[PDB]
Amino acid sequence: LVHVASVEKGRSYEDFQKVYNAIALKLREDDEYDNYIGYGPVLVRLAWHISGTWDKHDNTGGSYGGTYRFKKEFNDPSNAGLQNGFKFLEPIHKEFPWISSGDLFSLGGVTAVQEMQGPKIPWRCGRVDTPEDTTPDNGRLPDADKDAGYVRTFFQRLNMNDREVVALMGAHALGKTHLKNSGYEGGGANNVFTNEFYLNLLNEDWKLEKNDANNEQWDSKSGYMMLPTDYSLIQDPKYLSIVKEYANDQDKFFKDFSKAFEKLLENGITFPKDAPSPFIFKTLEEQGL
Numbered sequence: 380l381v382h383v384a385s386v387e388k389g390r391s392y393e394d395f396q397k398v399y400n401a402i403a404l405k406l407r408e409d410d411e412y413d414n415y416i417g418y419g420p421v422l423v424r425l426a427w428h429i430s431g432t433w434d435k436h437d438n439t440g441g442s443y444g445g446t447y448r449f450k451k452e453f454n455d456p457s458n459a460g461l462q463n464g465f466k467f468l469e470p471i472h473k474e475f476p477w478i479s480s481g482d483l484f485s486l487g488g489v490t491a492v493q494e495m496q497g498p499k500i501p502w503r504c505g506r507v508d509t510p511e512d513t514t515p516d517n518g519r520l521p522d523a524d525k526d527a528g529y530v531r532t533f534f535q536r537l538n539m540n541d542r543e544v545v546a547l548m549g550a551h552a553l554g555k556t557h558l559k560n561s562g563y564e565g566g567g568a569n570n571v572f573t574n575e576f577y578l579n580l581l582n583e584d585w586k587l588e589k590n591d592a593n594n595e596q597w598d599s600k601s602g603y604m605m606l607p608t609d610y611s612l613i614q615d616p617k618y619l620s621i622v623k624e625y626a627n628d629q630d631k632f633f634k635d636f637s638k639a640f641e642k643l644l645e646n647g648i649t650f651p652k653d654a655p656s657p658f659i660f661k662t663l664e665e666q667g668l
């Protein structure tokens with residue numbers, strides 16, 4: 380199964396920087412969401428979930444087709460809460476009806492990471508909306524109650540190695556868990572992209588507790604929480620080395636996250652050799668906006 384990137388007719392960098400800017404300005408405006416976290420974190424999670432359906436074995440799923448717009452995927456229990464991100468993006472799509480759905484969802488995540496002071500994440504256009512019958516079944520996104528071996532195996536389906544997994548997981552510095560979405564809860568409120576996920580793993584005094592949904596999670600006094608799968612990154616010796624590396628090198632973390640996140644958002648897509656180079660968007664701050 381081959382998905383060839385096809386640039387939205389006539390469009391160029393500048394068109395996409397205007398979409399980026401509309402997303403970024405809305406992120407600034409709609410500040411009250413989720414007790415003033417704002418929409419950044421949910422948009423990152425949306426971009427990941429629309430991509431994380433991909434299966435390297437047959438090229439099913441993935442960001443290309445924009446299939447989250449269809450009820451089977453929209454209603455996946457693994458996607459509970461992402462409707463908030465979709466509804467944030469609806470007026471953006473209204474304004475720029477020419478962008479594909481996969482382009483919009485993925486660009487939302489890039490815009491969120493950057494506006495949250497994260498690394499620059501190069502982004503390529505040309506995902507093309509595919510029909511309802513191409514929507515992947517539920518059950519392709521990962522469970523949170525499992526161990527390191529589960530995480531490692533899971534991510535092989537997405538063609539991600541240990542470093543890529545540990546880097547991607549650093550997004551769990553952002554936002555929070557909500558009991559009614561996932562059966563996990565914490566006092567998370569962070570909307571600045573940093574390496575503090577790794578610092579927190581190493582430096583906090585973690586307690587394995589049961590939450591109000593009767594699920595186990597790791598809690599600290601300071602208010603942080605880690606899923607079992609997060610904590611597994613310090614229970615496995617190979618993951619632990621990489622957690623230490625990122626806890627000790629913010630720039631390396633940024634660089635590795637950028638590469639892994641772009642890769643995640645591009646898995647399954649064939650870029651023609653005369654496709655445009657990846658775009659690196661300016662932040663609102665860089666533009667004086």
Ligand code: HEM
Pocket residue numbers: 420421423424427459460521522523524530547548550551553554555556557558560561562563606608640
């Ligand atoms: C083993 C892999 C992973 C598991 C089991 C997992 C699980 C979860 C769970 C259960 C939540 C809480 C959802 C809710 O209650 O609203 C969550 C939130 C989140 N996840 Fe993951 N996740 C994983 C990987 C990732 C990756 C790879 C990224 C992106 C690079 C990501 C980004 C996020 C973000 C940004 C949030 C916060 C959402 C918000 O604040 O609304 N996750 N994750």
Ligand SMILES: CN1C=C(N)C=CC1
Pocket residue numbers: 550551552553554555556565567568604605606609
């Ligand atoms: C703040 N967050 C904490 C986690 N353990 C997972 C997602 C987000």
